Design a protein around this ligand. Structure first.
Ligand SMILES: O=C(O)[C@@H]1C=CC(=O)N1C[C@@H](O)[C@@H](O)[C@H](O)[C@H](O)CO
Ligand code: NA
Length: 316
């Protein structure tokens, strides 16, 4: 097998995609001689539509664990070729039949420092007396766990999610929620000063700060999740996709990703390559982990369809 066209990788755009281009896409292109083209739009609904039409234009996707669970459940993915993906320094739990866990990321409460000098706690985010333009994630995933922790549900007691309660909690501040947005849209709103309080990926928050946004954040009520490399069923360059995944999950590219954006590696040999201070900005850091929870992809696997049908009518 050899690439005669570009290898198309679907991700989330903005600063995270810039980080993937710098750590993974351009280094892979240089190492292999493959032309690599990053695109946006990754998500369960789009992967489903594309795979079922038989018009697969994405060779690799980046999938968050609930989207990945739905994709696996619908048989939308090629099994990973582990004769090609060789990464024994990536723990076996991340090397799944249909995807390779390559990143651990937190989703955190962040606030504009000038609007909130004393910060914002998850309880304050869901307090109608606290005035501020709020932005929640675009889907029910992450949003529901945040609402529940904001309402005093202990991280250890999160799952099974009390969906009715979570929606009643969001109801308290719904009139102050300006949007249910994707990661790139949230970072843009922070930088432009069009939002005052958000729930977003740590890397997006810290990149907005790097760009001059006077915002702060905390690990209180944060939700950690795993991101996977997967290959849509019927991907025209499925074998080439395996070679990219193999390259990308090695210690050095994984370290280059965490160098540019505050998301964590799955490769155990990546952290010794990085500044020891990066550890403290990751979900696995014990002082951080105790203040939030880890997304339960088994619960989402079993409840996503029911939650989605409700969420759509809820935001509309
Ligand atoms: O793009 C990012 O920086 C981060 C990094 C991994 C990831 O899946 N991200 C997106 C999620 O934080 C989030 O935007 C999610 O896709 C939406 O809320 C819809 O489920
Ligand atoms: Na979401």
């Amino acid at each position: 097998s050899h690439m005669m066209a570009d290898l198309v990788i679907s991700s989330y755009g903005g600063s995270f995609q810039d980080a993937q281009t710098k750590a993974y896409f351009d280094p892979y292109a240089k190492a292999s001689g493959v032309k690599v083209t990053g695109t946006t739009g990754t998500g369960y609904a789009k992967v489903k539509a594309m795979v079922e039409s038989g018009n697969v234009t994405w060779d690799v996707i980046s999938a968050e664990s609930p989207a990945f669970a739905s994709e696996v459940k619908d048989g939308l993915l090629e099994p990973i070729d582990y004769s090609v993906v060789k990464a024994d320094n990536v723990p076996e739990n991340f090397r799944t039949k249909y995807g390779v866990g390559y990143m651990v990321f937190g989703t955190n409460l962040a606030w504009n420092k000038d609007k909130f000098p004393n910060g914002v706690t998850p309880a304050q985010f869901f307090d109608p007396n606290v005035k501020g333009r709020r932005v929640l994630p675009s889907d029910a995933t992450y949003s529901l766990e945040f609402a529940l922790m904001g309402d005093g549900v202990k991280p250890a007691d999160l799952y099974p999610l009390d969906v009715k309660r979570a929606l009643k909690v969001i109801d308290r501040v719904k009139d102050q929620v300006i949007g249910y947005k994707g990661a790139s849209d949230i970072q843009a709103l922070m930088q432009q000063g069009e939002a005052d309080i958000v729930y977003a990926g740590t890397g997006r928050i810290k990149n907005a700060i790097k760009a001059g946004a006077n915002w702060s954040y905390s690990w209180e009520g944060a939700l950690a999740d795993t991101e996977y490399w997967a290959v849509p069923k019927g991907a025209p360059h499925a074998a080439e996709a395996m070679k990219f995944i193999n390259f990308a999950v090695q210690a050095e590219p994984q370290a280059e990703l965490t160098r540019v954006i505050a998301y964590g590696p799955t490769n155990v040999d990546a952290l010794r390559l990085l500044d020891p201070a990066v550890a403290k900005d990751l979900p696995s850091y014990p002082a951080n982990a105790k203040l939030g929870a880890v997304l339960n992809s088994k619960w989402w696997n079993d409840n996503y369809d029911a939650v989605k049908a409700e969420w759509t009518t809820y935001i509309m």
